[PDB]
Symmetry: C3
Subunit: 89 residues, 3 copies
């Protein structure tokens, strides 16, 4: 049984705004790490959001991209994982 | 040639206990990152353990879940990677 | 459409040297996280580099391994992701 993992790497100023999008979309949780990077090196944030459906991962990704992709640094992608143990998913 | 990657995100108080489980099971190493998150946002820890067999990844995951899943925050999952270069695996 | 994700976990002293290899090879960016670990627990660094081709991921991995694998702690691997949104890739 595959589940989906959405990653969003973006500017630290978006921590609250992106966390709200994740929770309002119905994700059961999220993990965020402090990171740094260079793109198109400075401190930024990396979100990981596990979802039971591709649709939910897409909905979160699409909302973040629609709101912030044009005005903020951002990279995002999805992959699959298995053998999930979670308290509420 | 695929190898396995076990992820365990759990409470920081379990750092030593989970590290011991990983090493006693025979993993060749582990990586741990400081993180934060929300689940079922506060600081926590994310372990990544690469293993040569699914069996070893399962054994570590099963022991952590059996010991701590009922009493501590925890999410865990497995995925595959390739092109491994490691000193001892 | 799959894209590739190269991970390199290595000693913090190599931060600049590995960042230079990544950029000189033509990657569009990279992310780096502070981590800790044990191998063959101390602070180290984890790079993640997304690439449009397996060839580019291999070229970066091969250069890092050729330069530093014999003299420094290092583990590296590759996996795939999808649903990429990036500003320049
Ligand atoms: N090819 C890549 N591999 C890994 N991480 C990347 C890559 N490209 C961008 N990133 C990450 O995403 C962040 C944002 O990138 P981007 O939106 O291109 O603008 P910026 O150059 O301001 O970082 C970077 O700081 C980096 O952390
Ligand atoms: N759907 C999810 N996606 C990403 N990370 C998650 C998810 N659910 C939980 N987590 C991570 O696992 C941690 C533990 O979650 P959980 O055991 O549900 O309880 P808690 O609410 O105390 O965090 C969270 O703090 C978060 O880091
Ligand atoms: N099996 C593994 N799973 C996850 N991370 C690992 C594993 N083996 C090594 N690592 C990571 O790579 C780093 C370097 O490992 P290695 O080169 O074997 O030497 P060291 O023992 O000096 O760390 C470790 O500190 C750890 O972060
Ligand atoms: Cl990570």
């Amino acid at each position: 049984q595959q589940v989906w993992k959405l990653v969003i790497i973006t500017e630290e100023i978006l921590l609250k705004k992106v966390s709200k999008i994740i929770k309002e979309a119905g994700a059961s949780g999220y993990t965020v790490l402090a990171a740094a990077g260079e793109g198109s090196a400075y401190s930024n944030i990396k979100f990981e959001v596990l979802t039971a459906s591709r649709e939910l991962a897409d909905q979160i990704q699409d909302k973040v991209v629609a709101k912030y992709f044009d005005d903020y640094s951002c990279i995002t992608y999805i992959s699959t994982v298995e053998a999930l143990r979670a308290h509420k998913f």
